[PDB]
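Exercise 7.
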Amino acid sequence: STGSATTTPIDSLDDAYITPVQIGTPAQTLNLDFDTGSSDLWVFSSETTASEVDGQTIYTPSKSTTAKLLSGATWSISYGDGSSSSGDVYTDTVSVGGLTVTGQAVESAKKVSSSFTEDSTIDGLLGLAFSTLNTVSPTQQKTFFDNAKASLDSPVFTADLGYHAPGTYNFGFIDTTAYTGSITYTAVSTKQGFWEWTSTGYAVGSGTFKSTSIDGIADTGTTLLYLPATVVSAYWAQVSGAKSSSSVGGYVFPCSATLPSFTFGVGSARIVIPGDYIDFGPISTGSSSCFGGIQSSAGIGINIFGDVALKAAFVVFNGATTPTLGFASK
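Solution. The predicted structure, written as C-alpha cells, is:
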C-alpha cells in the first residue's frame, strides 16, 4: 500500500504545516502537525477541557463506531517549546492520504497548554519519530508509520515541505519526479529515538564550505534550524546589523536586509537553503526588526534540522531494519 497527502503551511511564515488525517468511522478529518521529532498521535477531542479549545476541530470518539477505549492507558507529553498536553487513549482507524491503519492509538487530550489553545489551525500532532519515544503508559504504543510499515510497498515515508506553499507527505514510495539529481543517503542513530544523523558541514552564502561534523535531528515539527553557536554566529556575521537579542530570544536582523543562503552537507552532497527561507518576519507587528530562521542550539542539547532546512530538500525517512535518511535537492 501507499499514501499521499498534501501538507499546508498554517500561516504566511511557514510556522508549521498541517496535513489532513481521517480518524474513525465515519471519518472525522482533523488537521494534524506531522512531527518527525516526536512519537505520539494526539488530538483535540470532546474530552478536552472546554476553556482550552478555541477553534480547533475535535475528535469525538463516541461518534466513531470503530473507536475503543484503551483501558487504563494515559499519556502526557512536553515539547521543546515548553508546550504540553495529556489525556487518555482510544484505538481507532486512521487514514492518511489513502493509507489506512486499523487499531491506531489515538491519544485524546484532556488538557493542552496555552500555545495549543491559542493556535486554532492545529488540531493535534502525528508523531513520526521512533516508537520508543511514545508516552503512553503503562503500555507504550506505536506510531502511525510503525503500524503501517509492514503493509507499505517500501518501508519509507518522505517529506517534501514547501516554502510559502503546500507540499507533500508520501508513505510507502519515493516519487522520483519530486526531486532533482540523486538522493544522498546518510546513517541514522536511533539511540535517542530521533531521526538523528551527522551533517558533513556548512557554507554561508557564496563562501567556502567548512567540513565539520554536525550531529542533529531531522525534525519536521520544529520550525527553525538550530545549530551550534559557532555556525550561527558565522551566518549572522554576514548580515549587517544582525545581533543576538536576549530580550527577543535569538538572532534578529534588519527587515531591510537581503539574507545570504545557507548550505549544509549530506555526505558529499550539498543542500542550499535560500536566504528568503531564513526570514521569519517582524518580531512584533510593524517592527523593522525581523526574526532569524537560523538560531543557536546551545542549551537545547541537540542540533535540530527543522523546517527551514528540510523544506529546501526532498527528504526520505527510510524505516528499513537499519534506518537511514535521504536528502535530494528539488
